[PDB]
Amino acid sequence: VPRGSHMILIKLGGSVITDKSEYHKFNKETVSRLADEIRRSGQDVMVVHGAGSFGHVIAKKYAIQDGHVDDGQIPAAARIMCDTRELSSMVVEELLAQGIPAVSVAPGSCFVMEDGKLIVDNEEPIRRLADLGIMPVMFGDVVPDRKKGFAIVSGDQCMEVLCRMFDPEKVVFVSDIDGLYTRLIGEVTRKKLDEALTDITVADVTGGVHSKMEAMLRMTDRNRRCYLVNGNAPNRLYSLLKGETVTCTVAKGGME
Amino acid sequence: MILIKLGGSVITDKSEYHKFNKETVSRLADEIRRSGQDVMVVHGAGSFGHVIAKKYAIQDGHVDDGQIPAAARIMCDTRELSSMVVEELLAQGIPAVSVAPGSCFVMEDGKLIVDNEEPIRRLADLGIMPVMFGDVVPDRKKGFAIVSGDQCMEVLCRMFDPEKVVFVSDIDGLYTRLIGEVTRKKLDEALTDITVADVTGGVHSKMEAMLRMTDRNRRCYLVNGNAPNRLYSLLKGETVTCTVAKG
């Protein structure tokens, strides 16, 4: 069995690593603990993180996610990319301090997007960084777009691209909630997804409960599982990465 | 249309580990702004990782697993310096973004392989200036390697074909007395002898380096960025104390 056959792809959600209530606020203590839990797990991981509040305020008042229509968006787009790159630096610092070599890989600095889809034409530098053991850390960013000028890629979309790239054995989304709610949805399967199509309720329609189960299922197969776990609960991520049963939402079995 | 390199010894004080000449970079960013010229900027790594790169001999390649945490430390330091450089650029109305070569490209035989050109051109075509810098880059033969600021200048010169190339240092220029002009005719007239040593400051190889970035029109300058408004004057076409190379 080769070297990276049990890789765990982990996303640290923006709502965990940043405080939305304040401006430019980084949850250093939370990220420090999560980095410690990642180290203690002993697992082989690749870390993605969201932008969170970093640039989201500026990207809203300029509608950056809708494309290049104004020449005043350019100083704002540059402002956002500087923000996300500075955020990733604070995230990488915590990983480095916890004995986890990593380097920020800004998607807007080396990739393009086209119709809400992230395109990675050259996979070589990313794969060499991972081979070296210098974990490449992608993150939500403003990316040049082939049609709208520029667009905004999400950490979740970075997660999907890396999932097809490296074929992890496990995918973990770290957020500030216990999981998916309907009340906590503990297990997501394709069968349980089709069953949810037979019951209609405004709570599970507004909020995209069915659509969130589907997105988790599309990152699983007959072996790989996809998890949603509360990173604000101390040592829950650690126990999950060790394979212990914890409070979470787990998708299993694949879509097909 | 003008390609600038901010030397590492200018934007960082090589006496401390994490020392960033903030107002010096702010001044130069303002002079770039006040000149009204179209600019693309590379910058040196300076003291941001140079102490660790020499301690672990990073430039020599991957020889043991003890170099991996040091390499990542260096790449975090250069990406942090670049953000501080971009901050001064943004504050002067210059949209810029850091393009870390170690995160985007690979290296082979001392060259920087830029296989995918589209993202850097789109950023430039959008007005968001791509800012490369010296970095640890995955190497196709050595595992990793160091990319020089000048090597970054080389690949960007071919890529965008600038009208002018400026190397911003903390010296007036090449010396021996100052050297004002550099040409192929001037270099060929130098009586070099392979059988003997002593090049005196190594100036001859530096004049060759500047000549490579010139053609039948484009000139390559070496200007003191510590002299106020000298970069501004140079960018606006004025004549100032410098070393100009031409071909």
TrEMBL record, chain A:
One matching Pfam family: AA_kinase
Keywords: ATP-binding, Isoprene biosynthesis, Kinase, Nucleotide-binding, Transferase
Major enzyme class: transferase
Molecular function in Gene Ontology: ATP binding; isopentenyl phosphate kinase activity; kinase activity
Residue positions binding ATP: 11-15, 52, 176, 208, 212
Site feature (Transition state stabilizer) residues: 20
Keyword Cell inner membrane: no
Start and end residues of each Aspartate/glutamate/uridylate kinase domain: 8-230
Domain of life: Archaea
Keyword Nucleotide-binding on entry: yes
An individual GO BP term: terpenoid biosynthetic process
EC number(s) stated in the UniProt entry for this protein: 2.7.4.26
Catalytic activity: isopentenyl phosphate + ATP = isopentenyl diphosphate + ADP
Annotated binding of substrate, by residue: 51, 56, 155
GO CC term, one of those recorded: cytosol
Family statement: Belongs to the isopentenyl phosphate kinase family.
Function: Catalyzes the formation of isopentenyl diphosphate (IPP), the building block of all isoprenoids.
Subunit structure, interactors included: Homodimer.
NCBIfam families listed in its UniProt record: IPPK_Arch
Name of the protein described by the UniProt record: Isopentenyl phosphate kinase
Species, as recorded: Methanomethylophilus alvi
